[PDB]
RNA sequence: GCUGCAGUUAAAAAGCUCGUAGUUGGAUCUUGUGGAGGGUUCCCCGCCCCUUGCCUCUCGGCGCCGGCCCGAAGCGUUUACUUUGAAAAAAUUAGAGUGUUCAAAGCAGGCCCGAGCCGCCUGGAUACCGCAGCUAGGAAUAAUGGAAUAGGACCGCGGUUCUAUUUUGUUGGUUUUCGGAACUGAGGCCAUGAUUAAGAGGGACGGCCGGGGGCAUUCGUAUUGCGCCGCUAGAGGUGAAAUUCUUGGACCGGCGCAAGACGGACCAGAGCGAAAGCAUUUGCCAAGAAUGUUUUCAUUAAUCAAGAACGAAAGUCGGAGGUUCGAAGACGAUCAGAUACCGUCGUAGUUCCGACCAUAAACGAUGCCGACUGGCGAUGCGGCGGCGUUAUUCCCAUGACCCGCCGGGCAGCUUCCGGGAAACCAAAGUCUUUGGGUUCCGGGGGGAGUAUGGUUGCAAAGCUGAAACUUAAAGGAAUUGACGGAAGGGCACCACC
């Protein structure tokens, strides 16, 4: 089956961060989990990443630091509509000062700082702090 | 695990004798051969799994025996791969 | 968890719902109206009668007394309530075959203390109060 | 894992990466093309052509000395089967089941077993019809069975 | 309990599988440079091929010197989503202003002059309004779209047919022409058109594997009965007895025959099956898992209301059979009583064939599918490799044993993985840092699986399933005591010998 990639994806390199690893191995590489990981890596969180190519979908191969915490997803995809924004990230973040829910707007895939900027709402896609 | 193990560049058989789908890249784990028997005095090229039998123009008329995995021949001889 | 997260499960979730929600002992009354039907009180807080004629009522153990309740019939339904009479010597400032106002203990359907069968208490006798009648700023009126 | 069966298994072919020649080889794209053609008159089946030319003759593949799939070619012909093998396949197993059963009722688990692969026949109609691969007036019962396997 | 619950044992996963609706579903189809706004590359015009995709034009303006250029007109396959506009009764609510004596309110009010100014100044905002509909911008995300039995491009030509009403000043007879439309052949031009094959599924192929199933067939010993032979007095049975059996002789020993039942030891934290279940021989009939494969198909999938198959034992109906055991029943004991535990006898049943019945502690008391996260030694099956021995023709091919490796399967051991109320569990883990997909189901203890109506069944019953009233506890795990006609040690003439 697996009928969400990304969702499969994070439980993997959040599980390998706590038990204490710096290398990973997370398949079947999607498109949706490179700019992801993209937006992650400026932050820093991780370092930079590795995608090996196979016909099949690749697969990537990460780098990885102890200042990550965790990462979540959020499924299903709900909208927000810039005022939806402010009771979401309550809920899912430790603290206003710091954190970043994700989201992907027709601007782009991009952390919700950002697009607020932009005046886009859009759908959201996961979190991590 | 030791909990730090590199996964990048692996070992030329000591992290290449996992299951060929458990590997980075896919890779067969067959092969070709260039046979030339002597009851059959042509340069025939087989697969090493053959799955049927193959027969001979020459005096004889087998070559390979299919079982359960790679198939043994009946007396033949000269083995390649080549290069794959 | 343990159950659909879908988008469009909307129909699945609020049927769901409205059905599970009956198992709850509260709402299976509320909305029945079995509450209604069985009660001998309309769901008013109060309610009139004529007594019908002075009981004892043994008490539950361990405690051990006699609590002279009542009984008596109801104007609107003409059917039958056992009804606590409270404190010392107000028995008394009750006579057979007059009128009396009842009102629920304060548990809103269950019994209450060590007596059992009661579930409703008696407040004026005829327009006076148990209060007035046994302090003694009023006085029977007959 | 499997579709009616609680297995869960892998054997999967794997191919390699490279997709050359390799090198080594020959019978130019046209040469595969008529050593294929004599091999469907003799009742060879698509899955068997590939198998008699791949353990035998120096291909690895005819998907890497032509630019099209085994079918397509004998399908560019006007030569391939009204039905696929896959369904015939099918088809052809749930006969004998049938007759076995007519020859002994009590046999209760042959019984059972029907009941799978007459479903799974369904599911795989309802593919191909939804495709415009099949009539969709097509179905499939007992003597609808019988003829088409003939 | 959507945000935000729980189901091993506390209330709780349909006996099991198939299956339509419903819900959910893999990967894949574009990036850099000067000017402008903000850093030191990066986010309105353009450029590499593209850049708001095009033309075709013609009517009504802008230009520059008849001729030429660029805005408006058809639109980019369709939607969701998001962003901007329009359009939204008041009161209420939020909220601006204002000294109601302050406030609840209210919509007012504030200024200078003796009146001699015949007046002046100023408010009565703004926000919000699920949906659905209307408007414009964005193109990531999620659906949908095209040429594979070819038609896309150009004034390319032919063949064929219909039609438009304009002009030779006008009006009538004729004929072409022009425009629109429709249909047919042969030929150029396209890089002339197919993304991969999921550590997803289906299907073929090869060699194997198993108390898997069906049908036929073969064999063993025991038990019981019968016949015959031999010896003589007790035999059965229990804690102790008795019913019962016995010189026409039992029990016991020997020999042969018949009937029905049944597959020991070997037989295991072993195997196969969806579950219920499945062990003597040999053959036949169809079926299936795992593994091997550089074969085939190309998303064909996951879970499931409706509906469907199988489903222990007992029971019911009709036939066959009836050794053994045996509800019921009749006896003998034990007991104050003893309709029981124990002993003897014994019907239904137990067995087979054909129909019904649908339930169990149908228990791992633990849904199914997928991903990730410790160590170690074994066992069953397939494949791969080998320094080693052995079996046969000295052989090779191969079997047996030895060592290692790769799959998937039944299990175990180990611990500050982590979780849990604890017992415990590499899953019951990755959960207040809560969201992978989906079905079923639970809401204090009784009343009650009762009442009632529906439905199925020949019967027995099954499924579906309340309330009135009553009560403050019921229940789980663990710890300390006491107790045990529980186990292992030790001790006493207030215990015994």
Same mark, same amino acid.
């Given at each position: ?59 990537? $191969? ?10 979540? $997803? ?56 | ?60 008329? $087998? ?22 | ?83 606590? $009479? ?57 | ?150």
């Amino acid at each position: 089956v697996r009928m969400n990639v990304l969702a499969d994806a994070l439980k993997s390199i959040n599980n390998a961060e706590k038990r204490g690893k710096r290398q990973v191995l997370i398949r079947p590489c999607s498109k949706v989990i490179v700019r992801f990981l993209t937006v992650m890596m400026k932050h820093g969180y991780i370092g930079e990443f590795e995608i090996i190519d196979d016909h099949r979908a690749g697969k990537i $191969v990460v780098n990885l630091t102890g200042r990550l915490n965790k990462c979540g $997803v959020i499924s299903p995809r709900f909208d927000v509509q810039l005022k939806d924004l402010e009771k979401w990230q309550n809920n899912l973040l430790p603290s206003r000062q710091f954190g970043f829910i994700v989201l992907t707007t027709s601007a782009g895939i991009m952390d919700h700082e950002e697009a607020r900027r932009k005046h886009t709402g859009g759908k959201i896609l996961g979190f991590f702090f | 695990m030791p909990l730090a193990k590199d996964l990048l560049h692996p070992s030329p058989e000591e992290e290449k004798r996992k299951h060929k789908k458990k590997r980075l890249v896919q890779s067969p784990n067959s092969y070709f051969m260039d046979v030339k028997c002597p009851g059959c005095y042509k340069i025939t090229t087989v697969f090493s799994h053959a799955q049927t039998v193959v027969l001979c123009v020459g005096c004889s008329t $087998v070559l390979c025996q299919p079982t359960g995995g790679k198939a043994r021949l009946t007396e033949g001889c000269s083995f390649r791969r080549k290069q794959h | 968890m343990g159950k659909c997260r879908g988008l469009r499960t909307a129909r699945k979730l609020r049927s769901h719902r409205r059905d599970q929600k009956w198992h709850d002992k509260q709402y299976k009354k509320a909305h029945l109206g079995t509450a209604l039907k069985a009660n001998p009180f309309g769901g008013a807080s109060h309610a009139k009668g004529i007594v019908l004629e002075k009981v004892g009522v043994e008490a539950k153990q361990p405690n051990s007394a006699i609590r002279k309740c009542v009984r008596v019939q109801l104007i609107k339904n003409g059917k039958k309530i056992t009804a606590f $009479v409270p404190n010392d010597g107000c028995l008394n400032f009750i006579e057979e075959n007059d009128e009396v106002l009842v009102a629920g203990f304060g548990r809103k359907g269950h019994a209450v203390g060590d007596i059992p069968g009661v579930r409703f208490k008696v407040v004026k006798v005829a327009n006076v109060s148990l209060l007035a009648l046994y302090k003694g700023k009023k006085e029977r009126p007959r | 894992g499997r579709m009616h069966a609680p297995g869960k298994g892998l054997s999967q072919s794997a191919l390699p990466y490279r997709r050359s020649v390799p090198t080594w080889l020959k019978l130019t794209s046209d040469d595969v093309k008529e050593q294929i053609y004599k091999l469907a008159k003799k009742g060879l089946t698509p899955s068997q052509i590939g198998v008699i030319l791949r353990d035998s003759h120096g291909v690895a593949q005819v998907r890497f000395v032509t630019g099209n799939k085994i079918l397509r070619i004998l399908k560019s012909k006007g030569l391939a089967p009204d039905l696929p093998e896959d369904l015939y396949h099918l088809i052809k197993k749930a006969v004998a089941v049938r007759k076995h059963l007519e020859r002994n009722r009590k046999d209760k688990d042959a019984k059972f077993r029907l009941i799978l692969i007459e479903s799974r026949i369904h599911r795989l109609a309802r593919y191909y019809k939804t495709k415009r691969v099949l009539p969709p007036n097509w179905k499939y019962e007992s003597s609808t069975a019988s003829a088409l396997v003939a």
